[PDB]
Amino acid sequence: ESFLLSKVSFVIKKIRLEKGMTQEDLAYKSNLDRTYISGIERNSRNLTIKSLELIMKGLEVSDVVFFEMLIKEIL
Amino acid sequence: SFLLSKVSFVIKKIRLEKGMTQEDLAYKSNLDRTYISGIERNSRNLTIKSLELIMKGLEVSDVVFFEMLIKEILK
DNA sequence: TGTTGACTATAATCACACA
DNA sequence: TGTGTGATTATAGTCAACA
């Protein structure tokens, strides 16, 4: 009652910090909301595919890399 | 209207690789057929939680799903 | 209940990728 | 060689009104 979503909501936080960004920066660059971005990283939002596609663009990272990094992270 | 269409392609593919109807995936993943139908028509927004249920009823891990998804991304 | 109608998947087939 | 994805007709299937 947690997995995958927890793993997806972790890589986002990993990359964002490795990119030296902020939740206010991510919410702005992905046209989303800081309250929404916050809740995700702490696993309090359901998160959709389209709402994830916006994140990778806000984080400035291709879809391929995100999933490749996602695959590793679960291991 | 891209990533949701690329994930959906893999959904029916493994469904057609494992050899099962949408009604079978609807049952095995505990989801309404109209919803399973929906995401394949392209689409319904599709939450991550629902996506996790799909893989469970698809008898495949997430790593083999994303790997297959990525292979379907590179052209 | 019974059935019409439009929107679907489904299944059989072909043909050209690819390895 | 060999399997497999794409595209195709064509059948069967779904659902959502109606009286």
Automatic annotation (TrEMBL), chain B:
Domain of life: Bacteria
Molecular function in Gene Ontology: DNA binding; DNA-binding transcription factor activity
One Pfam family linked to the record: HTH_3
Annotated GO CC locations: cytosol
Domain spans labelled HTH cro/C1-type: 11-66
Keyword Transmembrane carried by entry: no
UniProt KW keywords: DNA-binding, Plasmid, Transcription, Transcription regulation
Tagged with keyword Transcription: yes
Coiled-coil ranges per UniProt: none
PANTHER family tied to this protein: HTH-TYPE TRANSCRIPTIONAL REGULATOR (PTHR46797), HTH-TYPE TRANSCRIPTIONAL REGULATOR SUTR (PTHR46797:SF23)
Full protein name: Regulatory protein
Source organism of this protein record: Enterobacter sp. RFL1396
Gene that this sequence comes from: esp1396IC
